[PDB]
Design a protein around this ligand. Structure first.
Ligand SMILES: COc1ccc2sc3c(c2c1)NC[C@@H](CN)NC3=O
Ligand SMILES: COc1ccc2sc3c(c2c1)NC[C@@H](CN)NC3=O
Ligand SMILES: COc1ccc2sc3c(c2c1)NC[C@@H](CN)NC3=O
Lengths: 282, 282, 282
């Protein structure tokens, strides 16, 4: 009848008491690396981000905390303030994710190809995550495809959203629209294997974009509106059939996997271009 | 030889661990309701206010904390920061008070009537509370007669002051005078059954104000000075005989109880008028 | 392979639970006294500073915390926020030091006299302390000779630096140079028994300054540069031989002890003059 979750708690004791810290790096986001780490008690593996600990981070995380309560958002599990170098630091410990960047898992599918229906499901999820955040006044402002990772390597495995180095509180032309834009961008790459390309016209090649119902190409439109306005709100985005169908989407073959294999070098391009497009994007 | 009280402590674990939360509402102050709540361990009843948890509250309470150390001020007992809606919240747990708004207890006295001496004692107490606060640089700025409640329903029961939604630190024409004004207003209503009435002249009717020594009507004056200045300081207020007499005051009958019965509808008027007069009052 | 120290932790429970507080005063620095105090558990003696607890202190200590991890800097051991007077207070508990103000220990040497080599060692240490702080962006801004005290009264005993009422974070003509200046001043008094004297020329009398190698008188120079610039950086200061020699310095007799006995009244002069020179010094 009445339900709360514990507030955020900045543990002061040395993280080394509770965890055994490796040096094996995993992630390499904004500040510092993401080290693998093990829980002495339970003995499971964890992710360790490390922060300077100044007002900024201290709030950035403050949000992640609020965010973790969501499925498709990566869960924070412990937050410590210790003294590293000589520096009031900030170690946030979160569920390690052994799944690889959303896309990096599609180009090792190997067997068969990808599905319009599988694309939905992916997008579908990603949608959710943003919703929640927005639905609590949070703009992620960095929904790149590196920042999406899966829990494990099983195809049942789910993926979550990470790196709040960029999020901001939409408190008290606007803001939480990048998050949409991205989804758009994300969907594109998801279906074909590439984005736009300027600094806006995005064509839809034959060998890829075919009988792919204009209903879909519609979405991508509404989302990509180089406008900040009329960029289909997430609330909106979710409502649109394709998404909330999950399974009522065409089973169409998708070249994307193979496409990605086609020039794995045209990628560290894409990923930077994504950080290019965003980050600055107001 | 050396005496301190524990500092304020923002518990992070779910309040639901330590208390069992009802839904039975009691108070309906500023932010949210005041739910009844029970201590799992001891099993006694408690009051639960709930707050947005932003810098403001976080200090408002910070004061209440300092204030509770007083008898006639309602004691805070636990303060939690949990996550409700999706909202860093702030649950303050305090001694439940089963006594009813100061005045609401006088019009069910039924047996006999009220006493000039009983009025003192009441005022007397209320005085104290303000003192303390002032004596530590705190302006309550909302000493309405709803914000005064008794611990229990026994006539031995004492009353305390509540709702710090309004208090401010008189740190480093002025401020903590409203608190006086109010007392004045409070005394009036206490003796007769009504206040002033404009947006200042306050008459003193026959069937009420009689041989009621001008020494008393004096007080009320000094307090009500539509001035901010020459409004008798509390330090002053306490010194004046009538107050610090408690028992040396005339035993005069007071119609107030009956008066209040006389138009219980002319009341939600009074109470709002009190919030009117105050709140804005600089 | 991976090393951290616990972060700073503001205990909320009454310090009286963990320690038994005396009233025996020891230090009389900036805010309040420094009381002797005993650890109930272990039962050893401790120093207790007490603070108003406002943003300022709360950071001043925040630094001391980071600083204590150093040998020659006095270690903080516990920090409490309790409610004294009626005042959110701040009790910092640190290693008591039974050694007396650096200089106050030299004029009770009695046996023999002081050594150019002993002076080094002293300066040498003091140097270190500053280094660390600087080396983590901290200006002490108050390196007076009262703020240096020894752990015990044994000549093996070491001395440390105290009172961070003045320190500031050199974050993001300048600042952490006073700390140098002082050392200079300190060295002078250390070798002879007096400072400068204006509001700049410092002479070097016969009966004191003799065959005392110009290499030494050089130091003092570079340090005392009434400039803020070309005041020999600490990094620099440490590198200079005399210092990092410890034992390769001449064994020269020093009159300083006797000198100090010579007019112990010309001292509360010196010490204030030191606070004069500093404190304001930008
Ligand atoms: C591997 O398990 C994890 C778990 C959490 C997190 S958070 C995070 C990670 C990362 C990796 N990796 C680096 C980037 C995303 N590429 N940004 C981040 O903050
Ligand atoms: C019933 O036990 C309690 C105990 C504490 C408190 S505080 C508080 C209460 C209230 C009621 N009631 C609502 C108004 C006062 N009318 N404001 C407040 O903050
Ligand atoms: C005796 O054991 C101690 C231990 C720590 C500290 S800190 C401190 C002390 C003092 C004395 N004494 C007063 C002045 C320095 N003279 N300033 C300070 O803050």
């Amino acid at each position: 009848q009445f339900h709360v979750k514990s507030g955020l708690q900045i543990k002061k004791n040395a993280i080394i008491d509770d965890y055994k810290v490796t040096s094996q790096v995993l992630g390499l986001g904004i500040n510092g690396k993401v080290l693998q780490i093990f829980n002495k008690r339970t003995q499971e593996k964890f992710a360790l981000k490390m922060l300077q600990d100044c007002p900024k981070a201290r709030r950035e995380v403050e949000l992640h905390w609020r965010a973790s309560q969501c499925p498709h958002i990566v869960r924070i599990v412990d937050v410590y303030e210790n003294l590293y170098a000589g520096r009031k630091c900030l170690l946030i410990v979160m569920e390690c994710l052994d799944g690889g960047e959303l896309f990096s898992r599609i180009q090792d599918r190997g067997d068969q190809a990808f599905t319009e229906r599988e694309a939905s499901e992916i997008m579908k999820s990603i949608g959710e995550a943003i919703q929640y955040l927005h639905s609590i006044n949070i703009a992620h402002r960095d929904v790149k495809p590196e920042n999406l990772l899966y829990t494990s390597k099983r195809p049942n495995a789910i993926l979550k959203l990470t790196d709040f180095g960029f999020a901001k509180e939409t408190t008290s032309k606007y803001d939480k629209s990048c998050d949409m834009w991205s989804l758009g961008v994300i969907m594109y790459i998801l279906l074909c294997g590439y984005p736009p390309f300027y600094s806006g016209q995005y064509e839809f090649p034959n060998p890829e974009w075919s009988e792919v119902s204009e209903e879909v190409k519609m979405l991508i439109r509404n989302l990509l509106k180089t406008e900040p306005t009329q960029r289909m709100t997430i609330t909106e985005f979710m409502n649109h059939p394709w998404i909330m169908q999950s399974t009522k989407v065409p089973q169409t073959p998708l070249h994307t996997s193979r496409v990605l294999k086609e020039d794995k070098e045209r990628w560290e391009d894409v990923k930077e271009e994504m950080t290019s497009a965003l980050a600055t994007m107001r």
